[PDB]
Design goal:
Chains A, B, C: It comes from Halalkalibacterium halodurans (strain ATCC BAA-125 / DSM 18197 / FERM 7344 / JCM 9153 / C-125). Chains A, B, C: Keywords: Metal-binding, Zinc. This is part of a larger assembly, with 4 copies of chain A. Chain A is α/β, with parallel strands linked by helices and 410 residues long. In chain A, 52% of the residues lie in helices and 8% in strands. The two termini of chain A are 38 Å apart. Chains A and B meet through helix 6, strand 8 and helix 16 of A and helix 15, helix 16, helix 17 and helix 18 of B. Bound molecules: D-arabinaric acid (3 copies), chloride ion (CL) and zinc ion (4 copies). The site of one D-arabinaric acid (RAT) has 8 residues of chain B, from loops.
């Protein structure tokens, strides 16, 4: 029956240890960059954008408040003055309950008590256990002063944390970044010649050696195109692709983000745009020895992206990114994906910026993926097919963990 | 439980008095422009387009028939020859049943009897009571000869009816409209100079003074862009925006309509197109002291529009407009909206052209919005949150009425 | 009640004989072009694309394998190593069960036994009976050497099979095709003059005379536009349209296919793109005496296509084509269509390349269409409308068969 | 000297050497501007170019150029181009120039002559007198 299947699917999904292949979390020993707290959860930029639609407090005043005050404002405006029904607000409550706290009391002061008596290491153990996350993939930007520090000091991340070499500044801001490269000893010239090419490669190789990243990544605008006689186009073609092939490291492209449409909002000021599939199509076909992990921001790019994955095996689609990370969208995306790709895709990643988010991000997404799995297994069951519990666990393992590790070559 | 919640949500939704912030209805005392009748309901242009896909009667012959004959044809073709399953046909039946008539008999002659013995004022009282609509926002075009009359005669609308200054002819047909402005005493010159600017402002100010509109509005094509060195671009930049800021009146933009692709169909001859978000993005960011009410016609513009609202608080999204006003779409739009905006948006408007439509428009939309509210409240309930009935009524009040009045400054 | 209605709708839908207005099947007497077998089902290009996302076997090696080996590989990779949850894999199982075979045993060798002891004619009788398909519309390309043979030999197709004149080579590859036309006696000149025009018309007329097609068809790219001073634009304008009007034959346009993005994949190497609606809009309005059957490949073209059908009665929308032929999409498309068009559209076609697919294609689509019909009938039932079983059968007959025959003029 | 012209191929294939006052120039219009049609002739001549632009197609096109350079000993390779000429470009012309012509020309130190601006056959019936002209962008040459 469907209910017998349902229980097996839900059990398999809930018990399957998750490999979160894209987050903004950091190994505890890396320091304060690792954000956690009910205060951090409430000041997540997703909620900053949401509170600004309600509060009379200016954005300037908001940025001038302490994190405690910002959190108090957001709690009052989005949870008390109006029901916390949005996905992000729902997420906060899910994290609280998961930690054993009681959302029924709406006692923020009591919730804060829970966090103030623990250490980073302890909360990490707690959260990964609760979220059943075995591996976390970080976003490591060698262009950030704070992050560069731990890496240069020789600090190695926790074994549960993996590095990913983020290259946004290099690919999207070369004109400014080239100068920093020079200061660091990478002799790139004013013009794109053999010298500049080799030094950029040396730069990538040095960080690959230092981080041992599972992949190199970059977020791109709606106008992204390739090939292109631009700094980005040339760097990707002459340096990134060749280096990635040599070390058999996949290239992750997060396409569709239009940066800073509302500067004053900070991290909450980015917009979205539909991109052309031409560049991705070209990269996949012309670089068969390169591997590509892709996720797009526009709802209107989702279906064609699935179709492109049917064309090229060197393409691995992943997650329901940012503005796509909402139940209604996650549901439609996951169903279209399983329908045209079976289980050859990575349904989700958390993109967690605050440690505790791993709880709600995976909880909310797992229940949806579980329902989709139940429908699909049931359809073949009605066709006379018999699926074993072991086959279910196998499929679930591919979706939440094995597809990623298998694609990156680990 | 979910069923206890369901009843509370449905009750709150059904009892919440509605402020319909965009319709094509008129205060009864305004005259015959106020359309009502089972005949008017059946000759709604939405059904004209639908009947032309079935009937062998030429469009010319149709326009030559009396309204009674047109209604008879549409009833026969869309209700008798085929089941009235489309949204618009379903709407007609909902209006009948709501009025106490019986769709089971399919007796159009009997239905007509009900309307012929009442007055405009009486039917208005009846419908607003049935639809539980407390306030109706009109669309008042000072460029229409018939409408200009009541306003110039000094006629004030019923207290339940509010004015909205529609400016399509001014913004999209200035080359022709400028001449009428001159005939009315507004000395606009051949070239866009201080004189033309001031006289256009004087024109807007005079009508704002006469109508006391809750907002100024315009429908725009898929190709809409801003800024732009065109009559529209210049009028918006040099006159509309400044005047709207001074009187703190919001600017409503209904984007995506491609006018007259099938001229012979009349009001049923408009098409749709996806628009670029650039112009809206620019307006929101560069005019922070101006308020904007926006609704778009293309299904492919919906998600990005929600994201843009997360960026700018001077943007208030509203309704599921025209071709978007169908269950399947209303559902997906409302869910995406609540998920990314919580309750900071106006889910719907009727766009009613015929008085009785208020019944089905709100009935059909309320049941969908109610189901979405139930899902979202249930999700936070499962997270341990407890929502009171008063909080539900508060949220419902914001969605169906308070968000609008609060945004316009009333 | 809804369950009483449900049974009537499901019964009507299941019993309604289907006219499949677009397939890639052939009358049995046409020869081996008629594909059938569990081996053919498994080597369907939809599954080739899917297996290439999993298998380590090179595409070259795959094309070098025998059909038996290809089928074995696909069965092992997509059904045994991972659960066959994708739509195409689900389809294979549905066909097996429908034929009386047992998917529970996963015994491919036993399944093969069933097919090896029957004749084409026998399997055709079997499948059409099982799929309850009364009429099959073929895709007949006079430019294919193999197909041209039966037609030139004077072979007439089975009475259950209808011809459709496919013109892709003529319209999209005229520069190469013109030479073949000359070799066949059609004196087209180097330049587009009266001579070339008349000879192209003569060519179309000759094949219309030989095939007696229900319609002429062509698949078009995302960049399709009209009018256009190109071979395609000129051929459509000066030859196709005039000839189609004269014989009152509709023109079918399948828009949105980007051919060969992955050449090595063969038939599995096509991609998709969103098209502009301008060309279709122009054709519908400027050629009122011509009939057009249209289906588009991009998910983002679906809603506007429905709106365009509301504008022009000479437009008949049909099916959920190729990448659109997935439950999640079929559901949303069918609901948007019924909501804005009632029953004036053709919900589906199979596009079957392998005989047995008629079973799963129609089985999977019928259950979805049935659920949509049940919702819509229920909505008007709740409005007080009473629908008779005969009206249901009538509506179902229009959707699955009469709308097509009525539109083509048969 | 157009190796794609039947009449012209003869003398070269027969081993005929031109008068000492006459020098050869390898004209490549058919190769660069009509590859889709020309590729088939290359195949018939033994140059195994594939359907897709890969190492194989590249090497065989180079072999073709090298063979004729060897046979003609041209002072330069030449081509006439349309007003819309651009470079780089993901087209047959753009790829052939980038992956074959330029490399081969550098190796043998042979210059590349480009005669830009001709819009072919605007008046077909006039034959050789049917070509028109158009202003080109300097971007590709630059
Ligand atoms: O929080 C987010 O998802 C964004 O602000 C970014 O971190 C984005 O996911 C990125 O990786 O660029
Ligand atoms: O009936 C309609 O919705 C349209 O014909 C128009 O009234 C549109 O809503 C508009 O306001 O321009
Ligand atoms: O199998 C398919 O649907 C495609 O490969 C084509 O046959 C397409 O449907 C077409 O008719 O061009
Ligand atoms: Cl789109
Ligand atoms: Zn991220
Ligand atoms: Zn309106
Ligand atoms: Zn949906
Ligand atoms: Zn087909």
């Amino acid at each position: 029956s469907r209910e017998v299947l349902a229980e097996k699917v839900k059990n398999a999904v809930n018990n399957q240890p998750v490999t979160d292949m894209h987050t903004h979390l950091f190994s505890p020993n890396f320091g304060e960059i690792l954000l956690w707290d009910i205060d951090e959860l409430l000041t997540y930029h997703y909620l900053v954008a949401e509170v600004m639609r309600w509060t009379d407090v200016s954005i300037e005043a908001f940025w001038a408040m302490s994190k405690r005050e910002q959190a108090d404002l957001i709690w009052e405006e989005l949870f008390i003055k109006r029901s916390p029904v949005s996905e992000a607000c729902r997420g906060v409550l899910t994290c609280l309950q998961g930690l054993g706290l009681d959302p029924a009391t709406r006692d923020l002061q009591v919730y804060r008590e829970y966090f103030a008596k623990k250490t980073s290491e302890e909360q990490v153990d707690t959260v990964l256990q609760l979220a059943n996350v075995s591996d976390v993939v970080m976003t490591n930007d060698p262009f950030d002063d704070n992050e560069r520090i731990s890496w240069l000091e020789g600090k190695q991340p926790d074994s549960r944390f993996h590095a990913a070499l983020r290259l946004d500044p290099l690919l999207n801001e070369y004109e400014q970044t080239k100068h920093r490269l020079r200061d660091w000893g990478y002799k790139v010239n004013d013009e794109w010649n053999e010298g500049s090419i080799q030094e950029v490669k040396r730069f990538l190789t040095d960080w690959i050696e230092r981080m041992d990243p599972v992949y190199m990544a970059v977020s791109l605008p709606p106008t992204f195109s390739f090939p292109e006689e631009s700094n980005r186009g040339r760097i990707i073609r002459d340096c990134l692709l060749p280096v990635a092939e040599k070390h058999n490291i996949p290239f992750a492209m997060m396409i569709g983000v239009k940066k800073r449409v509302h500067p004053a909002l900070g991290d909450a000021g980015d917009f979205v745009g539909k991109a052309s599939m031409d560049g991705v199509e070209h990269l996949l076909r012309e670089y068969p020895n390169n591997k590509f992990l892709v996720t797009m921001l526009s709802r209107e790019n989702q279906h064609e992206l699935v179709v492109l994955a049917r064309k090229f095996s060197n393409l691995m689609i992943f997650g329901c990114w940012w503005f796509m990370n909402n139940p209604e969208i996650i549901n439609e995306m996951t169903r279209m994906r399983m329908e045209m790709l079976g289980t050859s895709f990575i349904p989700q990643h958390s993109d967690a910026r605050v440690l505790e988010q791993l709880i709600y991000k995976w909880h909310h997404s797992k229940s949806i993926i579980a329902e989709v799995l139940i429908d699909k297994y049931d359809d073949i069951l009605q066709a006379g097919w018999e699926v074993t519990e072991e086959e279910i666990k196998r499929d679930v393992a591919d979706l939440f963990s094995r597809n990623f590790w298998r694609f990156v070559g680990r």
